[PDB]
Nucleic acid binder design. Structure first.
Ligand SMILES: [Mg+2]
Lengths: 395, 98, 13, 51, 1339, 49, 49
DNA sequence: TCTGACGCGGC
DNA sequence: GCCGCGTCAGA
């Protein structure tokens, strides 16, 4: 009794499979069926009408699959072979002779359309990994192998879809999106990427960093206590040394996470990007960010008070440890403020877009060319430091 | 900023303390002394000069006591009511602004 | 008169 | 109205309530005229009462 | 260790020692209602209080008074289940003794007659059952407590947003319990304004003049006098030096001919000190420094007598001269320093247009009741009744308390009405706040928000009813002659009962009890709504009150609150919170004497807690209440910080004390973000009880208190031994020491078998004890729904694995093994009740027979001969449950149908079919059929059979009562009869009745025998009378709604299995909709080939920070590891001592652990019973913020020979090759929330349409279609899809003719549409034309 | 609007970008007139009734 | 038909407020006619209007 | 509520 | 001519 919805469209609907329901309507007349097939079919809405960017970007398990598939380990089973093609890479991997991240060398053939839309072939010994070569079998023709020779996070995937759409066209891109989803799910499963309590690695320095910050703040506290520094000065400097401490703990944990796997090369040890599953999730772009990783294994910073003011003592705990009662009770304020705000902003945004759609409902593209010479001078938008939007984007 | 800021830009609301603008080009002068408001008469060096405007005394005038100012120029400081942008600098001005 | 609209008031007055 | 008068007397004296048989005893109606009258007096509920 | 605890002990991590055990969780409801209906031999709040408030009622000086004596709650006619069955409120009649005294007229006060009325009945009040629920129309309701702004006076700022110039406009507001409001405010021009409740704004002094304060007196109230002398030269001035603080001098201020201050300088403290030393009193002052001042009093021209200058007048050189020459040596002025003493009252008096008392009354009158001419007396009477009438204004006890508290008065009990000094003190406090010497109050502070529970609210409604009865009573008392009339003709019961029943049935705060858990009920009853009468609204307020305040700590849960548009407005009460005498929330604290933490617990309100410095509950102490540290964390004045070991005053009584019951049931809460914990609490209270609840492996030790305090279990009332346990009853042979002297007896518990909830779930009790077991007081005897062994068990322990699995857990979605549905672990039972009503039409009554036209004997298969369905029938969609036909006439069928009836002789019957059939999609078993018939109507066979069943059952139940009761009694009879001589033969052989007249030795033997003789005769009469009355209850008719003949209710039981689409959730806000029932051989599986049961997506863990579910998963893996070890030891039937050693080791394995297992359990029997109860996994307990650290979890894992990393290696069931990077498997407690998918899936092609507009609508299992609201229309316009849109809003919805043409075309294989015009548009046209407006189509 | 249903959504990641899984019972209700037409067309039913 | 007085099951009648508004209009109009005929004191007729 | 707009009025 | 105020619409 459940409506089964393709995953790639979820972001469009802004859908969750956490209880959300959808409504189905059945177009009756022939005109309605043809409109649905030609205008409102899913395979036509791949670019968004807000900005020309794709709206069918793969979201979370599929980007984690592609990511993990397409990363490289510094010395893995079957390293340094010479593979006769992508099919041999897949055969190797499935038969268990080479790891998925084995820096290997394979002969690939990429077609590039140089003539009046004529794909000419270029074969070469690319230096790649097994996973990348396997993924190559999914890519349509007119695309360059450079598009899969990276570590292929979320953004890279979306731009690969966009380039396929700009080079080839609609149908190949739709088939491409389906293949990407399938293969990303497949290798996300094969990976068995999980999350355990050991993955949130606390930096060994967090204790020292915080102790030094506390010494510093007690120093400023007594300096005010004698009166050398005003109360406003005292509170401010307290805030500032705490912020520096929080930033230091962030840097420490991110350094311990983002490369931790020092592993041995065919000789002596060496270091590489990590495979900490929480780091992989955050780094691919599947889920999380430096913000949330930070709250998991760093310290969850300073909290604001209902009046928007910031409290002196920050939450020096993280969710991997326990928040004591006061720290938790403090965080609850920010959390409830966030929730109330989302509710009320739902209402307000609805009212706004209603006013917008009514002021502008009747605007239709009626004529083909007014043949006028007015215009505006679109220029890249700089403010102080540097460009916020380049020209290319604005024209 | 946020949703209220967009609602205000699109509702074209006057921003409670509008940075007043110079309607016409020409030299400026100060006139009546504080009935509650100083008179500034932008005095076109060429055309119909006599335009004057009574302005409260709280606005610090970028422009000098006697100064050759141009139309649609900032005089007081603050936000710019889009109505004035439109009226004085044209259409493209207000749309760039919005 | 207090500019009242209540007809009860008007009648009683 | 006569029924309501009589039902008030009955309710506050017997304590609990009158049943239509008990009313028809206090009145002299044929014990079915009572039921007709009891069916009448329900008043039309607005088609706008907030559900 | 109690016996029920020996059954299965929960390993309790958590180290802090509990010092105050959780109170009775429903004490709020029960105590409030107790206050309401309870003989109170004084005026304390209660029914008695309302009576004493309104009575005695004395005539309009008619020398006839109606006075009140006492009341008495009669016995309820029906029992609770009886009401739930017959659908009547469970109430009790309210009998009240009144007296009507007719005094002796024509002489001084003297009573001639007084009729003392035999307890005028004056309504029923709905009693509260033993769990704080009312049965109002057969449905259990709950009255939510309300959190409302306390009466009293409050000073607010209204900051910033006035006159675009800052200038905070301080205002004050007197809020009474009952009566009009009274606000004072400041305007930008510093003009003190008053406004009665919400009307126009008036200058404050109006009300001051209203209280008969002349302008002289006003200034004398709000100002200090400044004296001026003319001592033979030039306007001297008396001066006190501190009056001079912060000023600019206007003259040489020199006394004693020696200059101290210099004209034109800022005064220094040494200046004032000079003055204090010189004792400077009178200083000569120039006449211009007296220019700007203002005269205080009124000065007349005593040389002639006439006036000179009005009081509150600013002096001028002319006026100075005049007052001099007329002989005024002394001249008073107002001290108005614009730094401290703003001249606010003066400026107001200037704006004040009136002058006299009467004009002031007139102005108030013209503002209050505009339009009518102001009579003097009417103005007076309005103003007196406005704020000082007992009848129309009551501050409160609490109102008066908070008032005096706010004005820094000492007394607490005062008067209910305002007084002159009160208003004046309010104005003074407001003026002070404007001067800066005072602070405004925050409305959110829980020291200003009070709690009105059921007792108080019902008392208020009852007071309302009483006042309208008083209206009618005085009206009758004045009219006729009064000897003949008695004090029960005056007084009607319709109005009182109207008020009360209205409050209880149709009120925002009387809500259907949320009944799908024990937790759901017990959290509904501890709800604290801010809405309801006299509260906020979900759209009025308001970003501010919603936020948690530092005052909520310990009083209101900060995380348990709905997520929608009333976030922050529902606020589940906290665990240990209580209600002050006045209704302010207060929480317990351990009193800290000098350094030692004592154990006396003081309950502190909010404002009290504001002073002291309270230490956290997680502060280490050492066997002597000594803070082991030097400086300890505390909360002091709304802020937290470190404090000297010898500074604190109180300590938190426990670590659970800041959360609610819902949140205190989430293990590892302190590892979940607050958002996800909010969602987790809210969904946890939604789990639907499964087929056989088990327990949580990882609980928080609070399950027991919740499962017991909610009345869903049968709890022993006296200890004893289970004499007879049965699937439907439990009979306890009480112990001796608990028995009363007489009436030895036993204790019977009748369990509630399969029955309807309010959410259509099966509440149903199972006995957890076995025969001959010993039970103690307060022990659990029958596990209710969703409890197991007395522990709340909402969900099931699923073997979960965190990994992505081919996208089937893409978003929050879930992937469930088939073994979970095979074992029916989430199969729930849902009981519907379908009612067929046989009303009397005008065309004739309706019949319930099985004579139903053209439905084959396949359709009438399961109907009994009388037309009802057989009990036990497995039915499905459409089947006739109750065959019912209704009379019908006036066919007037079309010619072709007439030709049909001709060619086929089909007699067109006159009775239309209207039988009751099962709704589609639901396919269950009929488990009960009830039949009510309006008395007079002849019963049909089936009703008589159900009646016979009931009558047999009742006879047998009363028989079992008296039989097994005298079975215990006869056991005791022969026990006392071995005394008085152990007569074996002649005493036993005699019939057990041959003791009523026999004579024994004069001790307690013969005593008890004659006791049982009274017992015998009176219980014989009891059985006869009672069986008679119950038989009467059964055989009598039922008071059906007027017009109906008989009602038939059928109960369907459905066993809903889990399926793709149902929503499931752990306890930490990890929601999810299951998406594939996977075959077993596909699920991942470890080296022992055990497959996992649920495959959750790991990606949900980083973003949502609920990292608590991972910890729960590891700890569950550990617990089930212990359980598996003990199960293995139990399958080898190793021995008792092996099990004992291992289990003991498991129950230790921690530091500072508070589990305190006795270690002295019955060497073999109790230990083996334990191990049997632990082979499914050893239940752990994790108090909320005193959790179990990781290292302890790792140790538990090592004890079970499991990877301390918590992650094992898996294989893909589809290919059997190993997933790399070991995954996290474990055991999570998963609930199944009641958003079942087969209650969501609707769909319609065509159905019924609305009445005025012709658009779709339904409730009849063919609901309306989906709403195609604005936003969808814009979506279709954004595509170019014009034809889709047109057919969507023309033919699919509204075009009454086009839609049927479209249907006929559809069935004809031709897909085309004729648009026409939507009927809603014609309706809009007609409603415009029905104004005076001519709107029309043109061409 | 008629001809319309509602239900809970799940993933079903085996679909192609242009497909949605529709429950059988829902579809059998949404399209009922199409089905009436088709049945009468293939003679499997004499009449719409 | 747009301000309907539909009957519900069991004597309950559902009505639209427009019926009550119309009814008080008609009652006061008829009473005004009757007063105008009776030649009422002008205060009464004014109050009626 | 509250925010804004705005007749409408007082200065 | 310019500011304060009441009134209504809208979430
Ligand atoms: Mg959702």
């Amino acid at each position: 009794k459940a409506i089964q919805l393709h995953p790639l469209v979820c972001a469009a609907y802004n859908a969750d499979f956490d209880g959300d329901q959808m409504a189905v309507h059945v177009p009756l007349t022939l005109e309605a069926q043809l409109e649905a097939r030609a205008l409102m079919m899913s395979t036509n809405n791949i670019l968004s009408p807000a900005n020309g960017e794709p709206i069918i970007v793969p979201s979370q398990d599929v980007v984690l699959g592609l990511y993990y598939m397409t990363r490289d380990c510094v010395n893995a089973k079957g390293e340094g072979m010479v593979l006769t093609g992508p099919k041999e890479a897949e055969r190797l991997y499935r038969s268990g002779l080479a790891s998925l991240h084995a820096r290997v060398k394979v002969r690939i053939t990429e077609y590039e359309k140089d003539a009046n839309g004529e794909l000419v072939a270029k074969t070469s010994l690319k230096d790649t990994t097994v996973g990348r070569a396997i993924l190559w079998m999914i890519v349509p023709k007119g695309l360059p192998y450079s598009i899969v020779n990276q570590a292929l996070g979320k953004k890279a995937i979306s731009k690969m879809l966009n380039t396929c759409y700009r080079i080839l066209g609609l149908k190949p891109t739709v088939i491409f999106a389906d293949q990407i989803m399938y293969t990303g799910f497949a290798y996300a499963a094969r990976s068995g990427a999980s999350v355990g309590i050991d993955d949130m690695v606390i930096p060994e320095k967090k204790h020292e960093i915080i102790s030094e910050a506390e010494a510093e703040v007690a120093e400023i506290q007594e300096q005010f206590q004698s009166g050398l520094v005003t109360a406003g000065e005292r509170y401010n400097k307290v805030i500032d040394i705490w912020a520096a401490a929080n930033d230091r703990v962030s840097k420490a944990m991110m350094d311990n996470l983002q490369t931790e796997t020092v592993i041995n090369r065919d000789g002596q040890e060496e270091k590489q990007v990590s495979f900490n599953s929480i780091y992989m999730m955050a780094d691919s772009g599947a889920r999380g960010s430096a913000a949330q990783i930070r709250q998991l294994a760093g310290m969850r910073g300073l909290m604001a008070k209902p009046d928007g003011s910031i409290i002196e003592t920050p939450i020096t705990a993280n969710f991997r440890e326990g928040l004591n009662v006061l720290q938790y009770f403090i965080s609850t304020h920010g959390a409830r403020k966030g929730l109330a705000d989302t509710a009320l902003k739902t209402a307000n945004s609805g009212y706004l877009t209603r006013r917008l759609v009514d002021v502008a409902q009747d605007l239709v593209v009626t004529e083909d060319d007014c043949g006028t010479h007015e215009g505006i001078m679109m220029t890249p938008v700089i403010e102080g430091g540097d460009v916020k939007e380049p020209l290319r984007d604005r024209v | 900023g946020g949703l209220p800021r967009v609602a205000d830009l699109f509702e074209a609301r006057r921003p409670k303390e509008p940075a007043i603008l110079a309607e016409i080009s020409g030299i400026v002068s100060f006139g009546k002394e504080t009935k509650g408001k100083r008179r500034l008469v932008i005095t076109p060096v060429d055309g119909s000069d006599p335009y004057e405007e009574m302005i409260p005394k709280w606005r610090q005038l970028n422009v000098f006591e006697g100064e050759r100012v141009e139309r649609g120029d900032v005089i007081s400081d603050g936000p710019e009511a889009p109505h004035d942008i439109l009226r004085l600098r044209g259409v493209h001005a207000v749309t760039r602004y919005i | 008169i207090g500019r009242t609209t209540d007809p009860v008031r008007m009648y009683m007055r | 109205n006569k029924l309501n008068r009589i039902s008030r007397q009955m309710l506050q004296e017997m304590g609990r309530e009158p049943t239509p048989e008990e009313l028809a005893e206090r009145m002299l109606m044929p014990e079915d005229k009572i039921r007709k009258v009891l069916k009448i007096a329900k008043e039309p509920i607005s088609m706008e009462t907030p559900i | 260790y109690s016996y029920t605890e020996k059954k299965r002990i929960r390993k309790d991590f958590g180290k802090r020692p509990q010092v105050l055990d959780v109170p009775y969780l429903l004490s709020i409801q029960l105590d409030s209602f107790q206050k309401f209906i309870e003989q109170d031999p004084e005026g304390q709040y209660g029914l008695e209080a309302a009576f004493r408030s309104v009575f005695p009622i004395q005539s309009y000086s008619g020398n006839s008074e109606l006075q009140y004596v006492s009341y008495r709650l009669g016995e309820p006619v029906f029992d609770v289940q009886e009401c739930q069955i017959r659908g009547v409120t469970y109430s009790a009649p309210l009998r009240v003794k009144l007296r009507l005294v007719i005094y002796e007229r024509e002489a001084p006060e003297g009573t001639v007659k007084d009729i003392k009325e035999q307890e005028v009945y004056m309504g029923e009040i709905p009693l509260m059952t033993d769990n704080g629920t009312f049965v109002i129309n057969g449905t259990e309701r709950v009255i939510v407590s309300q959190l409302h702004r306390s009466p009293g006076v409050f000073f607010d700022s209204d900051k910033g947003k006035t006159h675009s110039s800052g200038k905070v406009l301080y205002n004050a507001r007197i809020i009474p319990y009952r009566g009009s409001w009274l606000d004072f405010e400041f305007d930008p021009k510093d003009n003190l304004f008053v406004r009665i409740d919400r009307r126009r704004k008036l200058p404050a002094t109006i009300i001051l003049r209203a209280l008969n304060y002349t302008t002289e007196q006003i200034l004398d109230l709000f100002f200090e006098k400044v004296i001026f002398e003319i001592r033979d030269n030039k306007l001297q001035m008396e001066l006190v030096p501190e009056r001079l603080r912060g000023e600019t001098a206007s003259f040489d201020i020199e006394a004693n001919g020696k200059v101290y201050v210099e004209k034109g300088r800022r005064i220094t403290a040494r200046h004032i000190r000079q003055l204090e030393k010189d004792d400077v009193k009178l200083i000569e002052v120039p006449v211009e420094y007296i220019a700007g001042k203002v005269v205080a009093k009124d000065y007349i021209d005593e040389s002639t007598g006439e006036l000179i200058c009005a009081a509150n007048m600013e002096l001028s050189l002319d006026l100075l001269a005049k007052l001099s020459q007329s002989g005024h040596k002394r001249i008073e002025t107002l001290f108005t320093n614009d730094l401290d003493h703003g001249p606010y009252i003066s400026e107001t008096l200037r704006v004040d247009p009136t002058n006299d008392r009467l004009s002031a009354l007139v102005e108030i009158y013209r503002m209050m009741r505009p339009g009518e001419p102001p009579t003097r007396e009417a103005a007076e009477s309005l103003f007196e009744n406005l704020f000082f009438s007992e009848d129309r204004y009551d501050l409160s006890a609490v109102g008066r308390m908070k008032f005096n508290r706010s004005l820094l008065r000492e007394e607490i009990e005062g008067s209910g009405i305002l007084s002159k000094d009160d208003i004046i003190d309010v104005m003074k406090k407001l003026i002070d706040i404007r001067n800066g010497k005072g602070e405004v109050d925050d409305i959110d502070h829980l020291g200003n928000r009070r709690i009105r529970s059921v007792g108080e609210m019902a008392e208020n409604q009852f007071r309302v009813g009483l006042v309208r009865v008083e209206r009618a009573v005085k009206e009758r008392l004045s009219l006729g002659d009064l000897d003949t009339l008695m004090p029960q003709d005056m007084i009607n019961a319709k109005p009182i009962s109207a008020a009360v029943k209205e409050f209880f049935g149709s009120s925002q705060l009387s809500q259907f009890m949320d009944q799908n858990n024990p937790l759901s009920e017990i959290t509904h009853k501890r709800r604290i709504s801010a809405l309801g009468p006299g509260g906020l609204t979900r759209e009025r307020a308001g970003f501010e009150v919603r936020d948690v305040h530092p005052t909520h700590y310990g009083r209101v849960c900060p995380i348990e609150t709905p997520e929608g548009p009333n976030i922050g407005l529902i606020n589940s009460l906290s665990v240990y919170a209580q209600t002050n005498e006045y209704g302010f929330l207060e929480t317990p604290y351990r009193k800290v004497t000098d350094g030692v933490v004592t154990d006396e617990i003081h309950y502190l309100s909010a404002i009290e807690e504001g002073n002291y410095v309270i230490a956290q509950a997680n502060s280490n102490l050492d066997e002597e209440g000594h803070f082991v540290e030097d400086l300890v964390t505390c909360r002091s004045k709304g802020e937290s910080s470190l404090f000297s070991r010898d500074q604190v005053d109180y300590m938190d009584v426990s670590t659970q004390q800041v959360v609610s019951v819902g949140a205190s049931l989430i293990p590892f809460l302190e590892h979940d973000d607050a958002n996800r914990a909010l969602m987790g609490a809210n969904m946890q209270r939604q789990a639907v009880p499964t087929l056989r609840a088990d327990k949580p492996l990882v609980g928080t030790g609070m399950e027991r208190a919740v499962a017991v305090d909610s009345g869903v279990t049968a709890v022993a009332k006296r200890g004893g031994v289970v004499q007879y346990v049965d699937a439907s009853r439990i009979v306890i042979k009480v112990n001796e020491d608990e028995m009363y002297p007489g009436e030895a007896g036993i204790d019977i518990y009748n369990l509630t078998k399969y029955t309807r909830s309010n959410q259509n779930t099966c509440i149903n009790q199972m006995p957890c004890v076995s025969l001959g077991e010993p039970v103690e007081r307060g022990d659990v005897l029958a596990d209710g729904p969703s409890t197991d062994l007395g522990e709340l068990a909402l969900g099931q322990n699923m073997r979960v694995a965190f990994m992505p699995w081919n996208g089937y857990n893409f978003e929050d979605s879930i992937l469930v093994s088939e073994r979970v549905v095979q074992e029916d672990r989430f199969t729930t039972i849902h009981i519907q009740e379908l009612a067929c009503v046989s009303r009397d039409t005008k065309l004739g009554p309706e019949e319930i027979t099985a004579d139903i036209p053209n439905v084959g004997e396949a359709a009438l298969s399961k109907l009994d001969e009388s037309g009802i369905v057989y009990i036990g029938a497995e039915v499905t969609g459409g089947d006739i449950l109750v065959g019912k036909v209704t009379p019908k006439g006036e066919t007037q069928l079309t010619p072709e149908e007439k030709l049909l009836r001709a060619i086929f002789g089909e007699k067109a019957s006159d009775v239309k079919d209207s039988s009751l059939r099962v709704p589609n999609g639901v396919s269950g078993t009929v488990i009960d059929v009830q039949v009510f018939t309006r008395d007079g109507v002849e019963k049909d066979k089936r009703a008589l059979e159900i009646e016979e069943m009931q009558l047999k059952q009742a006879k047998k139940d009363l028989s079992e009562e008296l039989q097994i009761l005298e079975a215990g009694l006869f056991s005791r009879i022969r026990a006392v009869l071995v005394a008085g001589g152990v007569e074996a033969e002649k005493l036993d052989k005699l019939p057990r009745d041959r003791w009523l007249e026999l004579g024994l030795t004069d001790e307690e033997k013969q005593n008890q025998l004659e006791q049982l003789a009274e017992q015998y005769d009176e219980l014989k009469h009891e059985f006869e009378k009672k069986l008679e009355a119950k038989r009467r209850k059964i055989t009598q008719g039922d008071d059906l709604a007027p017009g109906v003949l008989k009602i038939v209710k059928v109960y369907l039981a459905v066993k809903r299995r889990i399926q793709p689409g149902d929503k499931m959730a752990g306890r930490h806000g990890n929601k999810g909709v299951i998406s594939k029932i996977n075959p077993i051989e596909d699920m991942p599986y470890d080296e022992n080939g055990t497959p996992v049961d649920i495959v959750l997506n790991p990606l949900g863990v980083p973003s949502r920070m609920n990292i608590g579910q991972i910890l729960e998963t590891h700890l569950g893996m550990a617990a089930k590891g212990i359980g598996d070890k003990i199960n293995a030891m139990l399958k080898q039937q190793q021995e008792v001592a092996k099990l004992r050693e291992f289990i003991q080791r498991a129950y230790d394995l921690g530091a500072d652990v508070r589990q305190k297992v006795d270690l002295s359990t019955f060497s073999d029997e109790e230990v083996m019973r334990l191990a049997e109860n632990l082979r499914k996994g050893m239940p752990i307990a994790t108090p909320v913020f005193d959790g179990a650290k990781e290292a302890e979890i790792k140790e538990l894992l090592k004890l079970g020979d499991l990877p301390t990393s918590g992650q094992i290696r898996l294989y893909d069931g589809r290919t059997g090759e190993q997933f790399e990077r070991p995954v996290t498997v474990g055991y999570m407690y998963m609930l199944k929330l009641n958003h079942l998918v087969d209650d969501k899936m609707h769909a319609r092609s065509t159905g019924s349409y609305s009445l005025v507009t012709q658009q779709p609508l339904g409730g009849k299992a063919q609901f309306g279609g989906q709403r195609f609201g604005e936003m969808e229309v814009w979506a279709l316009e954004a595509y170019g899809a014009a034809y889709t849109l047109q057919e969507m809003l023309t033919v699919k919805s509204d075009d009454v003719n086009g839609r049927t043409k479209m249907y006929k075309n559809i069935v004809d294989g031709n897909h085309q549409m004729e648009p026409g015009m939507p009927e809603s548009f014609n309706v809009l046209l007609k409603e415009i034309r029905s104004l005076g407006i001519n709107i029309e189509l043109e061409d | 609007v008629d001809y319309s249903g509602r239900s809970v959504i799940t993933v079903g990641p085996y679909l192609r970008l242009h497909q949605c899984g529709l429950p059988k019972k829902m579809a059998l209700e949404l399209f009922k007139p199409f089905i009436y037409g088709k049945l009468e067309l293939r003679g499997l039913a004499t009449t719409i009734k | 038909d747009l301000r309907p007085l539909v009957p519900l099951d069991g004597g309950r009648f559902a009505t639209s407020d427009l019926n009550d508004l119309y009814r008080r209009v008609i009652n006061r109009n008829n009473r005004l006619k009757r007063l105008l005929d009776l030649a009422a004191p002008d205060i009464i007729v004014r109050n009626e209007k």
